[PDB]
Amino acid sequence: ASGIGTLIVFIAMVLVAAVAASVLINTSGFLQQKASTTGKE
Amino acid sequence: ASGIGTLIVFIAMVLVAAVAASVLINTSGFLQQKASTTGKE
Amino acid sequence: ASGIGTLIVFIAMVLVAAVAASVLINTSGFLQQKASTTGKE
Amino acid sequence: ASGIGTLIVFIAMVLVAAVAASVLINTSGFLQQKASTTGKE
Amino acid sequence: STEQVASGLLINGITGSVGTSDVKLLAIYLAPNAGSSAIDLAQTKVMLDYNGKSVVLGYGGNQDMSSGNSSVFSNDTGATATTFQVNILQDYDDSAVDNAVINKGDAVALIVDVNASFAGEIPERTAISGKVQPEFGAPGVISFTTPASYTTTLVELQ
Amino acid sequence: SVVLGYGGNQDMSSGNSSVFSNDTGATATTFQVNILQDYDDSAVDNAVINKGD
């Protein structure tokens, strides 16, 4: 009856984890390709 | 249920750390091989 | 639930980075315009 | 999260390096063209 | 926030004109720093400080495409007294001919009139500061402490 | 105060003489370019100076 503890927390935190990770991965390429040109220009 | 604290932060910061390190390693060879020729020319 | 790891560190370090950079940029103009006049006077 | 160590220091020191170099390059032409005329006059 | 720390604005030479009794026109050369994205000259304002007068300027509705011609102090200098005027010296991909956008590598001069904006003159042995704040970048600082003698009709200042 | 620009006339005088006697009639708002030395002919067209011209 009350054994649905995975549907409350597990799937939601997996999706929020994927979102909060995909922010940090995709926010780095802009700054690395902006900082790489600056030194050799 | 809420013990997925590694998937949020750990893998993402390892990848961002590798990216931010690979910028600093690869940005130095150009300037060292440009500065080494300048003195002895 | 615990996927708010960006609000803790990311925005705060971006703002502290901008402050610590804006110190170093704005502290140089005074000394360059004081040192440039000294030689040719 | 804390892998933004390049935006703090790298770009700022590159710009301060360019400023502190452009002082030393541009401060020499005045004194060389003042010292070159003095001997042959 | 990366665009604010990246951009800039670099002053590289200031000249002035004379010829009646005292200096009354200033010409300022200008070039963007080599990390700036897009400096927009429609919203950049110049401050000057002299004789208890702090003066704020704005953009004026007159420009020129003098890329090839000569005599900088002899074309379209009659729309002054509260604004500055813009001349173009170099533009490859013609991105600054209309609507005032400087890309990476242009050269733009500014002309400001002094007699009709300060209501007077600018004598020798003075010291004036000022800033050329862009929209979001970092300003370039002005210092043109005047020489003790005026000799020719075109004197260098910085 | 006079600002100049590039003019559409040049020469490949690497071997000849009399600098003031060849193709000096396209002036009055621009400058003119002559080449005195170029090994790997990188400045003969489209005006690129490498290390040593």
Side-chain angles (χ1 to χ4, degrees):
Chain A
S2 64
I4 316 166
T6 177
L7 193 148
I8 307 168
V9 179
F10 182 77
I11 301 169
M13 286 188 70
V14 166
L15 293 175
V16 171
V19 168
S22 296
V23 172
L24 291 172
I25 275 92
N26 290 116
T27 190
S28 179
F30 180 76
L31 58 90
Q32 66 166 351
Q33 292 178 355
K34 188 171 177 65
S36 179
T37 63
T38 304
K40 70 181 180 68
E41 287 179 352
Chain B
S2 64
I4 316 166
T6 177
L7 193 148
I8 307 168
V9 179
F10 182 77
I11 301 169
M13 286 188 70
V14 166
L15 293 175
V16 171
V19 168
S22 296
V23 172
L24 291 172
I25 275 93
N26 290 116
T27 190
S28 179
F30 180 76
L31 58 90
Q32 66 166 351
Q33 292 178 355
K34 188 171 177 65
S36 179
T37 63
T38 304
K40 70 181 180 68
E41 287 179 352
Chain C
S2 64
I4 316 166
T6 177
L7 193 148
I8 307 168
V9 179
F10 182 77
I11 301 169
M13 286 188 70
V14 166
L15 293 175
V16 171
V19 168
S22 296
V23 172
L24 291 172
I25 275 93
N26 290 116
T27 190
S28 179
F30 180 76
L31 58 90
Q32 66 166 351
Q33 292 178 355
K34 188 171 177 65
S36 179
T37 63
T38 304
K40 70 181 180 68
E41 287 179 352
Chain D
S2 64
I4 316 166
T6 177
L7 193 148
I8 307 168
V9 179
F10 182 77
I11 301 169
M13 286 188 70
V14 166
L15 293 175
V16 171
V19 168
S22 296
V23 172
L24 291 172
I25 275 93
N26 290 116
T27 190
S28 179
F30 180 76
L31 58 90
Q32 66 166 351
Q33 292 178 355
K34 188 171 177 65
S36 179
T37 63
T38 304
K40 70 181 180 68
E41 287 179 352
Chain E
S1 178
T2 309
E3 297 292 328
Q4 184 175 2
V5 68
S7 296
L9 201 281
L10 185 64
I11 301 298
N12 55 2
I14 294 169
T15 63
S17 177
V18 74
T20 62
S21 180
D22 193 81
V23 177
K24 64 181 179 68
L25 276 79
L26 291 175
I28 299 169
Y29 293 99
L30 190 147
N33 194 2
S36 66
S37 296
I39 300 300
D40 188 75
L41 287 177
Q43 290 173 357
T44 63
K45 292 185 180 293
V46 176
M47 275 85 84
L48 292 176
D49 290 328
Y50 179 70
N51 199 359
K53 293 181 181 179
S54 180
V55 173
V56 177
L57 296 175
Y59 182 74
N62 193 0
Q63 60 90 29
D64 196 359
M65 56 180 288
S66 175
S67 67
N69 288 318
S70 172
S71 70
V72 179
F73 292 104
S74 178
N75 283 318
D76 286 331
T77 179
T80 60
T82 188
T83 54
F84 61 93
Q85 293 177 355
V86 173
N87 289 322
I88 300 168
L89 295 176
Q90 181 180 1
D91 194 2
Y92 175 70
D93 56 353
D94 66 7
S95 65
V97 177
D98 193 74
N99 69 23
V101 174
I102 296 173
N103 54 7
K104 295 179 183 179
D106 290 336
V108 168
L110 300 178
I111 292 173
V112 179
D113 189 77
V114 178
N115 193 2
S117 181
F118 286 171
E121 68 270 15
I122 175 174
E124 64 188 3
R125 293 180 184 270
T126 62
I128 295 171
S129 67
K131 290 182 181 180
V132 201
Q133 283 84 2
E135 179 68 28
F136 60 93
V141 186
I142 300 172
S143 179
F144 59 105
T145 299
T146 58
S149 294
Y150 296 99
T151 60
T152 62
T153 59
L154 194 278
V155 62
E156 292 290 327
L157 280 77
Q158 181 178 0
Chain F
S1 180
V2 173
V3 177
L4 296 175
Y6 182 74
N9 193 0
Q10 60 90 29
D11 196 359
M12 56 180 288
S13 175
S14 67
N16 288 318
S17 172
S18 70
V19 179
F20 292 104
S21 178
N22 283 318
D23 286 331
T24 179
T27 60
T29 188
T30 54
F31 61 93
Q32 293 177 355
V33 173
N34 289 322
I35 299 168
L36 295 175
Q37 181 180 1
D38 194 2
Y39 175 70
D40 56 353
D41 66 7
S42 64
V44 177
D45 193 74
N46 69 23
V48 174
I49 296 173
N50 54 7
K51 295 179 183 179
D53 290 336

mmCIF file of all heavy atoms in Angstrom, chain C residues 5 9-10 13-14 17-18 20-21 24-25 28 32 35-36 40, chain D residues 1-4 7-8 11-13 15-16 19-20 23 27 30:
data_model
loop_
_atom_site.group_PDB
_atom_site.id
_atom_site.type_symbol
_atom_site.label_atom_id
_atom_site.label_comp_id
_atom_site.label_asym_id
_atom_site.label_seq_id
_atom_site.Cartn_x
_atom_site.Cartn_y
_atom_site.Cartn_z
ATOM 1 N N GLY C 5 22.643 22.120 -6.402
ATOM 2 C CA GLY C 5 24.063 22.366 -6.231
ATOM 3 C C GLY C 5 24.606 23.534 -7.025
ATOM 4 O O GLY C 5 25.728 23.972 -6.752
ATOM 5 N N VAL C 9 26.884 27.390 -5.261
ATOM 6 C CA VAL C 9 28.273 27.672 -5.572
ATOM 7 C C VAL C 9 28.440 28.484 -6.854
ATOM 8 O O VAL C 9 29.262 29.410 -6.878
ATOM 9 C CB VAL C 9 29.056 26.341 -5.654
ATOM 10 C CG1 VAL C 9 30.519 26.561 -5.991
ATOM 11 C CG2 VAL C 9 28.929 25.564 -4.351
ATOM 12 N N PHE C 10 27.655 28.195 -7.899
ATOM 13 C CA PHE C 10 27.932 28.670 -9.252
ATOM 14 C C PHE C 10 27.762 30.182 -9.372
ATOM 15 O O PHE C 10 28.694 30.890 -9.774
ATOM 16 C CB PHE C 10 27.007 27.934 -10.227
ATOM 17 C CG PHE C 10 27.221 28.288 -11.667
ATOM 18 C CD1 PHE C 10 28.300 27.777 -12.364
ATOM 19 C CD2 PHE C 10 26.327 29.113 -12.330
ATOM 20 C CE1 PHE C 10 28.495 28.095 -13.694
ATOM 21 C CE2 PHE C 10 26.516 29.435 -13.659
ATOM 22 C CZ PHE C 10 27.602 28.926 -14.342
ATOM 23 N N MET C 13 30.226 32.137 -7.049
ATOM 24 C CA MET C 13 31.600 32.201 -7.530
ATOM 25 C C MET C 13 31.726 33.009 -8.812
ATOM 26 O O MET C 13 32.777 33.611 -9.041
ATOM 27 C CB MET C 13 32.185 30.806 -7.735
ATOM 28 C CG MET C 13 32.530 30.094 -6.449
ATOM 29 S SD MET C 13 33.431 28.570 -6.765
ATOM 30 C CE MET C 13 34.996 29.222 -7.336
ATOM 31 N N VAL C 14 30.677 33.060 -9.640
ATOM 32 C CA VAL C 14 30.704 33.944 -10.806
ATOM 33 C C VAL C 14 30.748 35.409 -10.372
ATOM 34 O O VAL C 14 31.538 36.205 -10.902
ATOM 35 C CB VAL C 14 29.507 33.644 -11.731
ATOM 36 C CG1 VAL C 14 29.310 34.744 -12.755
ATOM 37 C CG2 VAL C 14 29.743 32.343 -12.474
ATOM 38 N N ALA C 17 34.113 36.102 -8.779
ATOM 39 C CA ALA C 17 35.095 36.146 -9.855
ATOM 40 C C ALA C 17 35.062 37.478 -10.585
ATOM 41 O O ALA C 17 36.114 38.043 -10.904
ATOM 42 C CB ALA C 17 34.829 35.007 -10.833
ATOM 43 N N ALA C 18 33.859 37.999 -10.847
ATOM 44 C CA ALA C 18 33.735 39.295 -11.504
ATOM 45 C C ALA C 18 34.277 40.418 -10.627
ATOM 46 O O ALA C 18 34.935 41.336 -11.129
ATOM 47 C CB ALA C 18 32.277 39.560 -11.874
ATOM 48 N N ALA C 20 36.642 40.098 -8.150
ATOM 49 C CA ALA C 20 38.088 39.939 -8.045
ATOM 50 C C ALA C 20 38.803 40.214 -9.360
ATOM 51 O O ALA C 20 40.005 40.499 -9.352
ATOM 52 C CB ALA C 20 38.431 38.533 -7.554
ATOM 53 N N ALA C 21 38.096 40.136 -10.485
ATOM 54 C CA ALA C 21 38.689 40.543 -11.750
ATOM 55 C C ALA C 21 38.610 42.055 -11.928
ATOM 56 O O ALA C 21 39.569 42.681 -12.395
ATOM 57 C CB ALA C 21 37.993 39.826 -12.904
ATOM 58 N N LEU C 24 41.428 43.905 -10.359
ATOM 59 C CA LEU C 24 42.714 43.850 -11.050
ATOM 60 C C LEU C 24 42.722 44.667 -12.334
ATOM 61 O O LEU C 24 43.767 45.214 -12.705
ATOM 62 C CB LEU C 24 43.086 42.398 -11.350
ATOM 63 C CG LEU C 24 43.440 41.511 -10.155
ATOM 64 C CD1 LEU C 24 43.597 40.067 -10.590
ATOM 65 C CD2 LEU C 24 44.715 42.007 -9.498
ATOM 66 N N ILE C 25 41.588 44.749 -13.034
ATOM 67 C CA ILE C 25 41.530 45.599 -14.222
ATOM 68 C C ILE C 25 41.586 47.074 -13.833
ATOM 69 O O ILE C 25 42.382 47.844 -14.385
ATOM 70 C CB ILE C 25 40.299 45.263 -15.089
ATOM 71 C CG1 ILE C 25 40.608 44.098 -16.038
ATOM 72 C CG2 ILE C 25 39.833 46.454 -15.917
ATOM 73 C CD1 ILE C 25 40.268 42.728 -15.536
ATOM 74 N N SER C 28 45.005 49.031 -12.527
ATOM 75 C CA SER C 28 46.182 49.163 -13.375
ATOM 76 C C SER C 28 46.258 50.490 -14.115
ATOM 77 O O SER C 28 47.362 50.923 -14.469
ATOM 78 C CB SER C 28 46.229 48.023 -14.397
ATOM 79 O OG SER C 28 47.353 48.154 -15.248
ATOM 80 N N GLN C 32 49.594 52.836 -14.621
ATOM 81 C CA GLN C 32 50.171 53.032 -15.950
ATOM 82 C C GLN C 32 50.191 54.507 -16.335
ATOM 83 O O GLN C 32 51.170 54.982 -16.921
ATOM 84 C CB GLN C 32 49.453 52.204 -17.024
ATOM 85 C CG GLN C 32 48.014 52.555 -17.349
ATOM 86 C CD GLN C 32 47.533 51.911 -18.629
ATOM 87 O OE1 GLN C 32 48.318 51.325 -19.372
ATOM 88 N NE2 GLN C 32 46.237 52.016 -18.897
ATOM 89 N N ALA C 35 53.023 56.056 -14.340
ATOM 90 C CA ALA C 35 54.360 55.673 -14.773
ATOM 91 C C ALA C 35 54.690 56.189 -16.166
ATOM 92 O O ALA C 35 55.872 56.341 -16.495
ATOM 93 C CB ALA C 35 54.509 54.153 -14.735
ATOM 94 N N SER C 36 53.679 56.456 -16.997
ATOM 95 C CA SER C 36 53.957 56.944 -18.343
ATOM 96 C C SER C 36 54.407 58.398 -18.335
ATOM 97 O O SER C 36 55.246 58.789 -19.155
ATOM 98 C CB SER C 36 52.721 56.778 -19.224
ATOM 99 O OG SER C 36 52.961 57.270 -20.531
ATOM 100 N N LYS C 40 58.809 60.552 -19.399
ATOM 101 C CA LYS C 40 58.914 61.666 -20.331
ATOM 102 C C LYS C 40 58.790 63.025 -19.653
ATOM 103 O O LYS C 40 58.823 64.045 -20.349
ATOM 104 C CB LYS C 40 57.875 61.535 -21.448
ATOM 105 C CG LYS C 40 56.434 61.751 -21.046
ATOM 106 C CD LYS C 40 55.534 61.568 -22.260
ATOM 107 C CE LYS C 40 54.071 61.764 -21.917
ATOM 108 N NZ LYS C 40 53.775 63.177 -21.559
ATOM 109 N N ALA D 1 31.048 22.697 -10.677
ATOM 110 C CA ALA D 1 30.545 23.779 -9.842
ATOM 111 C C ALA D 1 31.644 24.796 -9.563
ATOM 112 O O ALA D 1 31.476 25.989 -9.814
ATOM 113 C CB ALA D 1 29.986 23.231 -8.540
ATOM 114 N N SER D 2 32.774 24.317 -9.042
ATOM 115 C CA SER D 2 33.924 25.164 -8.748
ATOM 116 C C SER D 2 35.041 24.999 -9.774
ATOM 117 O O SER D 2 36.218 25.190 -9.449
ATOM 118 C CB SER D 2 34.439 24.889 -7.336
ATOM 119 O OG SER D 2 34.924 23.567 -7.206
ATOM 120 N N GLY D 3 34.692 24.660 -11.012
ATOM 121 C CA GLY D 3 35.675 24.529 -12.069
ATOM 122 C C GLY D 3 35.696 25.721 -13.002
ATOM 123 O O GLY D 3 35.834 25.567 -14.220
ATOM 124 N N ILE D 4 35.560 26.920 -12.439
ATOM 125 C CA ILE D 4 35.535 28.153 -13.217
ATOM 126 C C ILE D 4 36.792 28.920 -12.815
ATOM 127 O O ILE D 4 36.797 30.153 -12.712
ATOM 128 C CB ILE D 4 34.241 28.952 -12.965
ATOM 129 C CG1 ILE D 4 33.042 28.013 -12.963
ATOM 130 C CG2 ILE D 4 33.946 29.915 -14.119
ATOM 131 C CD1 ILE D 4 31.802 28.648 -12.410
ATOM 132 N N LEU D 7 38.134 31.694 -15.484
ATOM 133 C CA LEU D 7 37.469 32.986 -15.623
ATOM 134 C C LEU D 7 37.898 33.969 -14.542
ATOM 135 O O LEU D 7 37.783 35.183 -14.739
ATOM 136 C CB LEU D 7 35.950 32.777 -15.598
ATOM 137 C CG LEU D 7 34.941 33.861 -15.997
ATOM 138 C CD1 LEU D 7 33.724 33.198 -16.615
ATOM 139 C CD2 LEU D 7 34.497 34.715 -14.825
ATOM 140 N N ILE D 8 38.401 33.466 -13.418
ATOM 141 C CA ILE D 8 38.842 34.326 -12.330
ATOM 142 C C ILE D 8 40.169 34.984 -12.671
ATOM 143 O O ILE D 8 40.336 36.200 -12.536
ATOM 144 C CB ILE D 8 38.959 33.503 -11.034
ATOM 145 C CG1 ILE D 8 37.657 32.759 -10.754
ATOM 146 C CG2 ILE D 8 39.326 34.405 -9.868
ATOM 147 C CD1 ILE D 8 37.763 31.719 -9.680
ATOM 148 N N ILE D 11 41.925 35.262 -17.942
ATOM 149 C CA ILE D 11 41.604 36.360 -18.853
ATOM 150 C C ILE D 11 42.058 37.693 -18.268
ATOM 151 O O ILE D 11 42.598 38.553 -18.982
ATOM 152 C CB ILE D 11 40.093 36.355 -19.153
ATOM 153 C CG1 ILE D 11 39.676 35.027 -19.785
ATOM 154 C CG2 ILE D 11 39.712 37.491 -20.082
ATOM 155 C CD1 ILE D 11 38.178 34.844 -19.874
ATOM 156 N N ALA D 12 41.897 37.855 -16.952
ATOM 157 C CA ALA D 12 42.303 39.085 -16.282
ATOM 158 C C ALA D 12 43.814 39.275 -16.322
ATOM 159 O O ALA D 12 44.291 40.380 -16.603
ATOM 160 C CB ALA D 12 41.802 39.085 -14.839
ATOM 161 N N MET D 13 44.585 38.208 -16.086
ATOM 162 C CA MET D 13 46.035 38.349 -16.144
ATOM 163 C C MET D 13 46.543 38.492 -17.572
ATOM 164 O O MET D 13 47.569 39.140 -17.783
ATOM 165 C CB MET D 13 46.738 37.183 -15.458
ATOM 166 C CG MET D 13 46.666 37.230 -13.949
ATOM 167 S SD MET D 13 47.711 35.971 -13.205
ATOM 168 C CE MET D 13 49.335 36.623 -13.582
ATOM 169 N N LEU D 15 44.896 40.231 -19.885
ATOM 170 C CA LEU D 15 44.651 41.640 -20.192
ATOM 171 C C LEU D 15 45.613 42.563 -19.447
ATOM 172 O O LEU D 15 46.133 43.525 -20.031
ATOM 173 C CB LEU D 15 43.202 42.002 -19.880
ATOM 174 C CG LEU D 15 42.173 41.322 -20.785
ATOM 175 C CD1 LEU D 15 40.761 41.646 -20.335
ATOM 176 C CD2 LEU D 15 42.387 41.729 -22.232
ATOM 177 N N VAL D 16 45.881 42.276 -18.167
ATOM 178 C CA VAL D 16 46.839 43.070 -17.400
ATOM 179 C C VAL D 16 48.254 42.898 -17.953
ATOM 180 O O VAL D 16 49.037 43.859 -17.986
ATOM 181 C CB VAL D 16 46.729 42.703 -15.903
ATOM 182 C CG1 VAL D 16 47.840 43.324 -15.072
ATOM 183 C CG2 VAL D 16 45.396 43.177 -15.355
ATOM 184 N N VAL D 19 48.436 45.098 -21.049
ATOM 185 C CA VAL D 19 48.541 46.505 -20.658
ATOM 186 C C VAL D 19 49.951 46.833 -20.168
ATOM 187 O O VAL D 19 50.567 47.820 -20.602
ATOM 188 C CB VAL D 19 47.475 46.832 -19.597
ATOM 189 C CG1 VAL D 19 47.733 48.177 -18.969
ATOM 190 C CG2 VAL D 19 46.095 46.815 -20.227
ATOM 191 N N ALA D 20 50.493 45.998 -19.275
ATOM 192 C CA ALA D 20 51.822 46.231 -18.723
ATOM 193 C C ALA D 20 52.924 46.028 -19.752
ATOM 194 O O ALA D 20 54.030 46.544 -19.567
ATOM 195 C CB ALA D 20 52.061 45.316 -17.521
ATOM 196 N N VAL D 23 52.667 49.360 -22.090
ATOM 197 C CA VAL D 23 53.364 50.497 -21.492
ATOM 198 C C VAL D 23 54.838 50.490 -21.881
ATOM 199 O O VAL D 23 55.375 51.502 -22.349
ATOM 200 C CB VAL D 23 53.184 50.496 -19.966
ATOM 201 C CG1 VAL D 23 54.058 51.560 -19.325
ATOM 202 C CG2 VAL D 23 51.740 50.745 -19.624
ATOM 203 N N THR D 27 56.669 53.251 -24.332
ATOM 204 C CA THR D 27 57.454 54.268 -23.639
ATOM 205 C C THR D 27 58.876 54.399 -24.171
ATOM 206 O O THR D 27 59.611 55.276 -23.704
ATOM 207 C CB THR D 27 57.512 53.976 -22.138
ATOM 208 O OG1 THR D 27 58.080 55.103 -21.461
ATOM 209 C CG2 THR D 27 58.385 52.765 -21.868
ATOM 210 N N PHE D 30 59.749 57.375 -27.723
ATOM 211 C CA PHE D 30 60.013 58.770 -27.387
ATOM 212 C C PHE D 30 61.463 58.971 -26.976
ATOM 213 O O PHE D 30 62.145 59.873 -27.478
ATOM 214 C CB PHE D 30 59.075 59.221 -26.267
ATOM 215 C CG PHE D 30 59.267 60.653 -25.856
ATOM 216 C CD1 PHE D 30 58.778 61.683 -26.643
ATOM 217 C CD2 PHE D 30 59.935 60.969 -24.681
ATOM 218 C CE1 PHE D 30 58.954 63.006 -26.269
ATOM 219 C CE2 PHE D 30 60.117 62.285 -24.302
ATOM 220 C CZ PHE D 30 59.623 63.305 -25.096
#
